[PDB]
Design an enzyme around this catalytic site. Structure first.
Site, PDB file in Angstrom:
ATOM      1  N   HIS A 243       0.820  -1.213   0.000  1.00 33.73           N
ATOM      2  CA  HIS A 243       0.000   0.000   0.000  1.00 33.73           C
ATOM      3  C   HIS A 243       0.852   1.260   0.000  1.00 33.73           C
ATOM      4  O   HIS A 243       0.816   2.059   0.939  1.00 33.73           O
ATOM      5  CB  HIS A 243      -0.941  -0.024   1.207  1.00 33.73           C
ATOM      6  CG  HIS A 243      -1.970  -1.107   1.133  1.00 33.73           C
ATOM      7  ND1 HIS A 243      -1.898  -2.263   1.883  1.00 33.73           N
ATOM      8  CD2 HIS A 243      -3.084  -1.220   0.372  1.00 33.73           C
ATOM      9  CE1 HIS A 243      -2.927  -3.040   1.585  1.00 33.73           C
ATOM     10  NE2 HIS A 243      -3.661  -2.428   0.672  1.00 33.73           N
TER      11      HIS A 243
ATOM     12  N   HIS B 228       1.306   1.718  -5.748  1.00 30.84           N
ATOM     13  CA  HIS B 228      -0.065   1.236  -5.735  1.00 30.84           C
ATOM     14  C   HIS B 228      -1.039   2.367  -6.085  1.00 30.84           C
ATOM     15  O   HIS B 228      -1.968   2.189  -6.873  1.00 30.84           O
ATOM     16  CB  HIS B 228      -0.386   0.682  -4.339  1.00 30.84           C
ATOM     17  CG  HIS B 228      -1.804   0.235  -4.175  1.00 30.84           C
ATOM     18  ND1 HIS B 228      -2.355  -0.768  -4.939  1.00 30.84           N
ATOM     19  CD2 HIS B 228      -2.782   0.658  -3.342  1.00 30.84           C
ATOM     20  CE1 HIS B 228      -3.617  -0.946  -4.582  1.00 30.84           C
ATOM     21  NE2 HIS B 228      -3.898  -0.093  -3.615  1.00 30.84           N
TER      22      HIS B 228
ATOM     23  N   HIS C 197      -6.494   6.973  -2.388  1.00 22.57           N
ATOM     24  CA  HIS C 197      -7.256   5.961  -1.650  1.00 22.57           C
ATOM     25  C   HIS C 197      -6.601   5.172  -0.518  1.00 22.57           C
ATOM     26  O   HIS C 197      -7.320   4.597   0.311  1.00 22.57           O
ATOM     27  CB  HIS C 197      -7.946   4.991  -2.624  1.00 22.57           C
ATOM     28  CG  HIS C 197      -7.066   3.882  -3.093  1.00 22.57           C
ATOM     29  ND1 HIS C 197      -6.055   4.071  -4.008  1.00 22.57           N
ATOM     30  CD2 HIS C 197      -7.027   2.572  -2.751  1.00 22.57           C
ATOM     31  CE1 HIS C 197      -5.429   2.924  -4.211  1.00 22.57           C
ATOM     32  NE2 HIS C 197      -6.001   2.000  -3.458  1.00 22.57           N
ATOM     33  N   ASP C 198      -5.272   5.128  -0.475  1.00 22.23           N
ATOM     34  CA  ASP C 198      -4.585   4.424   0.615  1.00 22.23           C
ATOM     35  C   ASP C 198      -3.587   5.350   1.289  1.00 22.23           C
ATOM     36  O   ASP C 198      -2.610   4.897   1.890  1.00 22.23           O
ATOM     37  CB  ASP C 198      -3.838   3.177   0.115  1.00 22.23           C
ATOM     38  CG  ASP C 198      -4.724   1.951   0.044  1.00 22.23           C
ATOM     39  OD1 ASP C 198      -5.560   1.767   0.953  1.00 22.23           O
ATOM     40  OD2 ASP C 198      -4.561   1.163  -0.904  1.00 22.23           O
TER      41      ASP C 198
ATOM     42  N   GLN D 104      -5.051 -17.765  -3.425  1.00 25.94           N
ATOM     43  CA  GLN D 104      -5.330 -16.914  -4.577  1.00 25.94           C
ATOM     44  C   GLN D 104      -6.567 -17.422  -5.309  1.00 25.94           C
ATOM     45  O   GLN D 104      -7.450 -16.642  -5.672  1.00 25.94           O
ATOM     46  CB  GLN D 104      -4.116 -16.889  -5.507  1.00 25.94           C
ATOM     47  CG  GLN D 104      -2.975 -16.079  -4.933  1.00 25.94           C
ATOM     48  CD  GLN D 104      -3.362 -14.633  -4.774  1.00 25.94           C
ATOM     49  OE1 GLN D 104      -3.441 -13.896  -5.757  1.00 25.94           O
ATOM     50  NE2 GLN D 104      -3.634 -14.217  -3.541  1.00 25.94           N
TER      51      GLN D 104
HETATM   52  N1  LIG Z   1      -7.736  -9.888   1.231  1.00 23.10           N
HETATM   53  C1  LIG Z   1      -7.023 -10.307   0.179  1.00 23.10           C
HETATM   54  N2  LIG Z   1      -6.571  -9.421  -0.689  1.00 23.10           N
HETATM   55  C2  LIG Z   1      -5.882 -10.002  -1.698  1.00 23.10           C
HETATM   56  C3  LIG Z   1      -5.617 -11.339  -1.903  1.00 23.10           C
HETATM   57  N3  LIG Z   1      -4.876 -11.524  -3.063  1.00 23.10           N
HETATM   58  C4  LIG Z   1      -4.707 -10.316  -3.533  1.00 23.10           C
HETATM   59  N4  LIG Z   1      -5.287  -9.346  -2.749  1.00 23.10           N
HETATM   60  C5  LIG Z   1      -5.275  -7.903  -2.982  1.00 23.10           C
HETATM   61  O1  LIG Z   1      -4.311  -7.309  -2.111  1.00 23.10           O
HETATM   62  C6  LIG Z   1      -4.943  -6.214  -1.402  1.00 23.10           C
HETATM   63  C7  LIG Z   1      -4.349  -5.925  -0.053  1.00 23.10           C
HETATM   64  O2  LIG Z   1      -5.109  -4.874   0.567  1.00 23.10           O
HETATM   65  P1  LIG Z   1      -6.708  -4.922   0.579  1.00 23.10           P
HETATM   66  O3  LIG Z   1      -7.251  -3.549   0.685  1.00 23.10           O
HETATM   67  O4  LIG Z   1      -7.166  -5.765   1.721  1.00 23.10           O
HETATM   68  O5  LIG Z   1      -7.128  -5.601  -0.823  1.00 23.10           O
HETATM   69  C8  LIG Z   1      -6.366  -6.694  -1.290  1.00 23.10           C
HETATM   70  C9  LIG Z   1      -6.616  -7.216  -2.695  1.00 23.10           C
HETATM   71  O6  LIG Z   1      -6.824  -6.177  -3.629  1.00 23.10           O
HETATM   72  C10 LIG Z   1      -6.102 -12.284  -0.961  1.00 23.10           C
HETATM   73  O7  LIG Z   1      -5.969 -13.514  -0.968  1.00 23.10           O
HETATM   74  N5  LIG Z   1      -6.810 -11.665   0.071  1.00 23.10           N
HETATM   75 MG   LIG Z   2      -7.177   0.489   1.237  1.00 23.31          MG
END
Ligand SMILES: Nc1nc2c(ncn2[C@@H]2O[C@@H]3COP(=O)(O)O[C@H]3[C@H]2O)c(=O)[nH]1
Ligand SMILES: [Mg+2]
Ligand SMILES: Nc1nc2c(ncn2[C@@H]2O[C@@H]3COP(=O)(O)O[C@H]3[C@H]2O)c(=O)[nH]1
Ligand SMILES: Nc1nc2c(ncn2[C@@H]2O[C@@H]3COP(=O)(O)O[C@H]3[C@H]2O)c(=O)[nH]1
Length: 329
Positions: free
Chosen positions: A80, A84, A118-119, A281
């Site tokens: 993040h 990103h 956004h982050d 995944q």
């Molecule tokens: N929660 C989650 N996010 C994943 C995974 N694989 C890829 N991502 C991506 O990685 C990001 C990490 O931050 P996020 O905001 O939780 O959103 C997540 C998804 O866009 C997974 O297995 N779990």
């Molecule tokens: Mg976020």
């Protein structure tokens, strides 16, 4: 202000930056990977704003200060981060270049800025962690904890001297764009995606979806934000795989912290359970990514390349699971 501010050298440098001519056409495409062009990232964002809303959409000096200060307030975390932010903004740009007549000038400006921010100031920790360990941020923001913080930090940057790119809007439009940005940033909380997608599916299938209905519109924009936030899964396989490494590096660091405090992390955040990643995944693509892009393609058909790309990567993860993967770097 409690925000870090760019230096004169930083923003003046951006103001004078010129993107290579041949690269411009590539930026229009959904699969574009900003990865190999780090020095050009802020410049790519300026270009996208100009192509979407015109060269006078924002006063150039203020826009350059805004961008460079936003960059300075992203932390050095594995995923993040600043990279990103620009990656997500580019996906929004590609979506808008293929659906621009459906959105207003104000919405296009708001969404691109929302994506870049956004982050903002992400600490490398999930909402799950913050709430579990009663972090002050979770006391202040009960749900969508980090997202509410990201919006607050965005407003804070606009308040830095010479950084308010929206001050020339009428007072009504100023309030409107801040609301577009707030809802858009909050929409990137994946916890909200499930309900939003379910509602949009119902609206679409019953034939009640009306893009001119503000409530419907907010939901469509929310799904667009989810789609952009998740776009690492829509790149060419090697790019998607490399990004997954960063995503997990951040997850594992969070898991390490949990173990130190006596709380065992979920497998996904456990560095010692990396063998479970491919299956994880597959689970994520099936539960989140594929349905997201499937619904987005239904509602805005020109976004189909994102779905096609996601399906291709799902197939690559399946190959990994079957032990058919080639060489990875
Ligand atoms: N929660 C989650 N996010 C994943 C995974 N694989 C890829 N991502 C991506 O990685 C990001 C990490 O931050 P996020 O905001 O939780 O959103 C997540 C998804 O866009 C997974 O297995 N779990
Ligand atoms: Mg976020
Ligand atoms: N902390 C902080 N530093 C500021 C603020 N405004 C200007 N500066 C700093 O003052 C510096 C003056 O020279 P500079 O190289 O342009 O970089 C500038 C910033 O580092 C502010 O609101 N907060
Ligand atoms: N804190 C801080 N403010 C600076 C700096 N350079 C310029 N400023 C500006 O000078 C202003 C003085 O009043 P202020 O309300 O504290 O806000 C400050 C900033 O906008 C700096 O290095 N530090």
């Amino acid at each position: 202000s409690h925000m870090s501010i760019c230096t004169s050298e930083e923003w003046q440098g951006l103001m004078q930056f010129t993107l290579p001519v041949r690269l411009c056409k590539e930026i229009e495409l959904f699969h574009f990977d900003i990865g190999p062009f780090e020095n050009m990232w802020p410049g790519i964002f300026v270009y996208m704003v100009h192509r979407s809303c015109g060269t006078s959409c924002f006063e150039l000096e203020k826009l350059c200060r805004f961008i460079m200060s936003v960059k300075k307030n992203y932390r050095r975390v594995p995923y993040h981060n600043w990279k990103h932010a620009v990656t997500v903004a580019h996906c929004m740009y590609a979506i808008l270049q293929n659906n621009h007549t459906l959105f207003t000038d104000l919405e296009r400006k708001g969404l691109l800025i929302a994506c870049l921010c956004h982050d903002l100031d992400h600490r490398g920790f999930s909402n799950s962690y913050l709430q579990k360990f009663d972090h002050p941020l979770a006391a202040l923001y009960s749900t969508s904890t980090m997202e509410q913080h990201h919006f607050s930090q965005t407003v804070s940057i606009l308040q830095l001297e010479g950084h308010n790119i929206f001050s020339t809007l009428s007072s009504s439009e100023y309030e409107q764009v801040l609301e577009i940005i707030r809802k858009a940033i909050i929409a990137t909380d994946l916890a909200l995606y499930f309900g939003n997608r379910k509602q949009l599916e119902e609206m679409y299938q019953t034939g009640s979806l009306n893009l001119n209905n503000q409530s419907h519109r907010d939901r469509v924009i929310g799904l667009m934000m989810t789609a952009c936030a998740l776009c690492s899964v829509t790149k060419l396989w090697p790019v998607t795989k490399l990004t997954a490494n960063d995503i997990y590096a951040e997850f594992w660091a969070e898991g390490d912290e949990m173990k130190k405090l006596g709380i065992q992390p979920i497998p996904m955040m456990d560095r010692d359970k990396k063998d479970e990643v491919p299956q994880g995944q597959l689970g994520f693509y099936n539960a989140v990514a594929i349905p997201c892009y499937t619904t987005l393609t239904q509602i805005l058909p020109p976004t189909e390349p994102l779905l096609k790309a996601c399906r291709d990567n799902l197939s690559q993860w399946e190959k990994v699971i079957r032990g058919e993967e080639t060489a990875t770097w």
